[PDB]
Design a protein around this ligand. Structure first.
Ligand SMILES: Cc1noc(C)c1-c1ccc2c(c1)nc(CCc1ccccc1)n2CCN1CCOCC1
Length: 113
């Protein structure tokens, strides 16, 4: 399968918009984690490949995703980073789990069509 980066933007962005629409749950994920602001100097040691909603959006806008699984992989990376770093009792971990539930519902059909 070959994929038109504009047809992939138009097909995938509604799945990304679905994540942005979650308030408060998307708020920690809208910009890159800043360990200095959050006071977590070990973050970049634990998380080798950061990802966040703004980075995925800019990649989608710059035609960075040759095929859609590459997009799906970045969304799951963002989730797995937050689950790795954060305690299970934490607000951000629980927010992550909510976003992943939203993403699974939204991406399911899209990757069918
Ligand atoms: C994602 C992610 N993965 O691990 C962590 C930690 C995060 C993360 C990532 C970001 C998180 C955040 C958690 N909690 C807040 C709000 C509470 C806060 C705590 C310390 C200092 C400031 C705020 N944010 C901040 C969200 N702001 C909202 C406004 O735009 C900038 C980020």
């Amino acid at each position: 399968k070959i994929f038109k980066p504009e047809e992939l933007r138009q097909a995938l962005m509604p799945t990304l918009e679905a994540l942005y629409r979650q308030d408060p749950e998307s708020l920690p994920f809208r910009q890159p984690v800043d360990p200095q602001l959050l006071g977590i100097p070990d973050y970049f040691d634990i998380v080798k490949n950061p990802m966040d909603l703004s980075t995925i959006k800019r990649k989608l806008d710059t035609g960075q995703y040759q095929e859609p699984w590459q997009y799906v992989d970045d969304v799951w990376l963002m989730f797995n980073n937050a689950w790795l770093y954060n305690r299970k009792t934490s607000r951000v971990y629980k927010f992550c789990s909510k976003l992943a539930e939203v993403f699974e519902q939204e991406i399911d059909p899209v990757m069918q069509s």
